[PDB]
Amino acid sequence: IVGGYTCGANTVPYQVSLNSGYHFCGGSLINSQWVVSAAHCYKSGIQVRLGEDNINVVEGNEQFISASKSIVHPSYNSNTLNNDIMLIKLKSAASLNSRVASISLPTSCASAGTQCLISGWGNTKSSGTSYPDVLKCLKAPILSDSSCKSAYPGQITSNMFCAGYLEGGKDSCQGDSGGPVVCSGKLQGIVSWGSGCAQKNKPGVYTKVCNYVSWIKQTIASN
Ligand SMILES: NC(=[NH2+])c1cc2ccccc2s1
Numbered sequence: 024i025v026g027g028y029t030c031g032a033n034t035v036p037y038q039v040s041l042n043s044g045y046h047f048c049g050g051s052l053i054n055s056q057w058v059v060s061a062a063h064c065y066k067s068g069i070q071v072r073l074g075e076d077n078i079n080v081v082e083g084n085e086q087f088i089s090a091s092k093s094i095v096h097p098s099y100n101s102n103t104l105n106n107d108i109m110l111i112k113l114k115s116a117a118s119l120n121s122r123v124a125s126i127s128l129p130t131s132c133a134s135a136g137t138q139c140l141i142s143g144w145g146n147t148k149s150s151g152t153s154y155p156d157v158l159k160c161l162k163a164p165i166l167s168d169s170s171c172k173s174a175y176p177g178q179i180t181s182n183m184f185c186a187g188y189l190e191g192g193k194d195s196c197q198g199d200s201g202g203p204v205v206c207s208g209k210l211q212g213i214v215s216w217g218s219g220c221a222q223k224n225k226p227g228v229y230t231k232v233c234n235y236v237s238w239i240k241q242t243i244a245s246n
């Protein structure tokens with residue numbers, strides 16, 4: 024996350040770190056047994072880490088649970104990143120408490136202009152590499168589709184939306200992939216892609232979760 028701030032320990036209780044020997048993606052806990060992340064975060068051998076703040080230090084509130092299965096969306100296109108969403112089932116249910124909680128799925132899609140909270144342990148420099156150990160947060164509004172499409176011509180589908188500042192400076196970045204974009208208490212997006220990070224006229228592109236609620240619900244009830 025570039026141009027953001029330190030969240031504070033466990034203030035984003037639904038935030039997850041996917042680890043395969045090291046942290047490689049973020050995710051969101053939607054209920055005690057399931058996590059939603061980005062399909063481009065797919066790997067075999069994933070351990071889900073809940074109640075994290077510093078991911079390099081066991082501070083006492085963590086729960087490390089292995090995944091029993093991963094389900095990448097049936098129509099995910101790795102070339103365009105269209106339908107960039109994946110569900111991960113935990114081998115055991117997480118113990119929800121003040122530090123580990125689930126986030127609600129949306130009942131409708133949010134309006135451009137709505138302010139959201141984006142978080143993750145990704146790079147914090149636009150030009151350079153600095154990976155933080157504690158969770159970083161960013162409040163950014165959803166941009167209109169017109170500004171999103173003019174920034175990325177022929178690349179935005181109806182399953183993506185842009186959030187950020189066209190002036191650059193604040194944005195999500197690699198390492199933040201799969202993480203949550205929460206607006207008004209609901210999970211509206213998933214960190215998916217962008218051109219560089221915090222660049223002028225290159226906002227972040229997020230998977231539009233409101234388009235997958237039926238698929239999520241149906242998939243979890245049958246697995
Ligand atoms: N500009 C951005 N918001 C992003 C850029 C990248 C690049 C790689 C992986 C994830 C992301 S999010």
Ligand SMILES: [Ca+2]
Nearest residue numbers: 077078080081
């Ligand atoms: Ca830790």
